[PDB]
């Protein structure tokens, strides 16, 4: 549910990043928060910083 319009490749990347997060703490299990921050990192994309540009359309 945390993946609005995410490709399957992005899903696999999220799994890999969750595994990476677990590896950082030198563990072998992965937790829900690991997946949450993996989703945050993988799906991160630059948006329209300028509110003025973003508010042209109604």
């Amino acid at each position: 549910e945390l993946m609005p319009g995410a490709s399957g490749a992005e899903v696999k990347g999220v799994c890999t990043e969750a595994g990476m997060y677990a590896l950082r703490e030198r563990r072998v299990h992965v937790t829900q928060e690991d997946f949450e921050m993996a989703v945050a990192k993988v799906m991160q994309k630059d948006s329209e910083k300028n509110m003025s540009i973003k508010k042209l359309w109604k």
């Binding site: 910083k49 300028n50 509110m51 003025s52 540009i53 508010k55 042209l56 359309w57």
Partner: protein, 232 residues
């Protein structure tokens, strides 16, 4: 995409007008300006730093009042800012003449947005390269609005535009709280200006103005220096 970034009366096949976007880009290149809507009023600040100390800092002002209770600041071009000031003052007093009542800031923002969008209607007349921050106090509520060269006008609890506007916006997100008071709002605004001032803001290097139930007024260099020392 190049062949459609040349006229104001042609739609790019994908999106919208490119000259409007270029005008907004010119706006982003202006002197940073910060507006904050406090609980009891509104405060808008801007930087007046310029080389060649020969320049008389009191000669021109980036902050001007439109009526007894509405003021504005700009980001972008200067002469366009002055033209917008003239149009806003004339229009506000026309509304006053028709209604014998101080102008509601929302209506002034709507109508000034209309007048600037009028310049975007046809070719041969470039859109204003200036974005407006409008502060006012009406009916027991402080109003802060932003008016765009495109004619879009929107509300803002606290915003920052001009140069380094994105980082100032982030800063405002971090520091802003809805229960803010006027003096603390001024402190936050001056802190935001300092965050990208690049060169030790002085009493005249920054121009700030406050609006509340006692109308709107631009702060003199004395109170500006006092607040700067208080922030240090």
């Amino acid at each position: 995409e190049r062949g459609y970034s040349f006229s104001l009366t042609t739609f790019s096949p994908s999106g919208k007008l490119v000259q409007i976007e270029y005008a907004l880009a010119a706006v982003a290149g202006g002197a940073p300006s910060v507006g904050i809507k406090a609980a009891n009023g509104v405060v808008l600040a801007t930087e007046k730093k310029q080389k060649s100390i020969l320049y008389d800092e009191r000669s021109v002002h980036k902050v001007e009042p439109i009526t007894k209770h509405i003021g504005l600041v700009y980001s972008g071009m200067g002469p366009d800012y002055r033209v917008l000031v003239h149009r806003a003052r004339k229009l506000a007093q026309q509304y006053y003449l028709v209604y014998q009542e101080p102008i509601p800031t929302a209506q002034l923002v709507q109508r000034v947005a209309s007048v600037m969008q009028e310049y975007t209607q046809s070719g041969g007349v470039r859109p204003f390269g200036v974005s407006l921050l409008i502060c006012g106090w009406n009916e027991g509520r402080p109003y802060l609005f932003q008016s765009d060269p495109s004619g879009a006008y929107f509300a803002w609890k606290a915003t920052a535009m001009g140069k380094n506007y994105v980082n100032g916006k982030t800063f405002l997100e971090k520091r802003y709280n809805e229960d803010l008071e006027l003096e603390d709002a001024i402190h936050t605004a001056i802190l935001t200006l300092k965050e990208s001032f690049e060169g030790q803001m002085t009493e005249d290097n920054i121009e700030v103005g406050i609006c509340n139930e006692a109308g709107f007024r631009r702060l003199t260099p004395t109170e500006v220096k006092d607040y700067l020392a208080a922030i240090a």
